[PDB]
Amino acid sequence: QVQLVQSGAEVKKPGSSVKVSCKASGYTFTTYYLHWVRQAPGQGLEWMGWIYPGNVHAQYNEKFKGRVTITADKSTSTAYMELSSLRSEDTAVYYCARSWEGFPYWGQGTTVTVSSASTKGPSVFPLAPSSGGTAALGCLVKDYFPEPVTVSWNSGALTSGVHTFPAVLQSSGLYSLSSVVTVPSSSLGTQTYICNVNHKPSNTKVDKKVEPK
Amino acid sequence: DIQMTQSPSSLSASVGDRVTITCKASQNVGINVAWYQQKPGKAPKSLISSASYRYSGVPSRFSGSGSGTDFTLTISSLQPEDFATYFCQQYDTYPFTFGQGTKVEIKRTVAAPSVFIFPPSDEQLKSGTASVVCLLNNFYPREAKVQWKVDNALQSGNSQESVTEQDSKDSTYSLSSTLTLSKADYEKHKVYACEVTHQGLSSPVTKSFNRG
């Protein structure tokens, strides 16, 4: 019954600002500290600050102080974290959390990407099977922004043996990923293998048939 | 600020095992420490409060102990749902700070990767770039090394890789590496190879193709 429901994903340019919201329900909002914590995949979890709702005073991590503001509206039971002068290292998942001798309740998280890149759909290339009994094939999904892309095989009919890998961020600022499947060699040749790629920000939907040679 | 250092950074275990994760605080933090569990893609879930108090609804197999600078999370008998990363946190003084996480992974028998190399497609080459891909499929443990060679020349700085999360059914990992070249560079060389090393391979495995 306690719920913390955050706003959706954001993509911002370096130097700009983002405001993430946290709507609390299931308890009296003005009775507990609400904190913000972020997680970037190479600085772990990092505490940002708190606010006691109904009271204008907030407390910040010195690492963020000078470019972070936490606010709360008791009327709407909503807290906010605004982070300014955004830099690429602020790319992270931002969480609100309710405090009691630790953080017993957490919001679902809000992904924020900081990049100067523009929205772009991917190019999809085959990873063709080579010339004992199993074969690997795949699709390379190159040069898209922002995340995510989804990949299926044979429109969801092929799930066994599939690995869709984490994307990598290239120096261009665009992402690339691969998806592979292993199948019986004998099948190269009675079965059709098609990778279906979907990138929603660009409404890119591509079906690539993957075959020998 | 207070550094929270967890040991080990990772741990392999089986269902039924007793698992212990420790956390050393760089300064005294009393009993003002909490423990969390997090699974890939999900928010943390709280386990222990005030060093040793189990949050409401947390299974009895989770226990916490310690005070001052040394803290311990114990899982008495690991369950299928307990493979995850565990974090400690101090809330004694500001800034609140977290440990780096300890990953509890599923132990299995060692498995050498199956290695596959994929040349660039003809479609891509038109674009003026060549991506060569190396797949290391279904191996264990996670530690593997891929080296790219172009006409026997070890490559540096022109590849990227990523690794899947441990498979929930077979307990293996897979890794994909991409070597990126300009079409002009690609066309200047014949032999493209990835060389793989892994505990399960008594010597390195090389997969190669000749352009054309």
Coordinates of all heavy atoms in Angstrom, one line a residue, chain B residues 1 73 108 115 123 137 146:
Chain B
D1 N 34.0 11.8 3.7 CA 32.8 10.9 3.7 C 33.1 9.5 4.2 O 34.3 9.2 4.1 CB 32.1 10.9 2.3 CG 31.9 12.3 1.8 OD1 32.1 13.3 2.5 OD2 31.5 12.4 0.6
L73 N 25.8 -9.3 6.7 CA 24.5 -9.8 6.3 C 24.7 -11.4 6.1 O 25.7 -11.8 5.4 CB 24.1 -9.2 5.0 CG 22.7 -9.8 4.5 CD1 21.6 -9.3 5.3 CD2 22.5 -9.3 3.0
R108 N 27.9 -23.0 -10.9 CA 27.8 -24.2 -11.8 C 29.1 -24.7 -12.1 O 30.2 -24.1 -11.8 CB 26.9 -23.9 -13.0 CG 27.4 -22.8 -13.9 CD 26.9 -23.1 -15.3 NE 27.5 -24.2 -16.0 CZ 27.0 -24.9 -17.0 NH1 25.9 -24.5 -17.6 NH2 27.7 -25.9 -17.5
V115 N 32.7 -20.3 -29.6 CA 33.2 -19.0 -30.2 C 32.7 -19.0 -31.7 O 32.9 -20.0 -32.4 CB 34.7 -18.8 -30.0 CG1 35.1 -17.5 -30.6 CG2 35.1 -19.0 -28.5
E123 N 25.8 -5.0 -47.1 CA 24.9 -3.9 -46.9 C 25.6 -2.8 -46.1 O 25.6 -1.6 -46.4 CB 23.7 -4.2 -46.1 CG 22.8 -5.3 -46.7 CD 21.8 -5.8 -45.7 OE1 21.0 -5.0 -45.1 OE2 21.8 -7.1 -45.5
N137 N 29.7 -17.8 -26.5 CA 28.4 -18.2 -26.1 C 28.4 -19.2 -24.9 O 29.2 -20.2 -25.0 CB 27.6 -18.8 -27.3 CG 26.1 -18.6 -27.1 OD1 25.7 -17.5 -26.8 ND2 25.4 -19.7 -27.3
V146 N 38.9 -11.5 -25.0 CA 38.8 -11.6 -26.4 C 39.9 -10.6 -26.9 O 40.0 -9.6 -26.4 CB 37.4 -11.1 -27.0 CG1 37.4 -11.1 -28.5 CG2 36.4 -12.1 -26.5

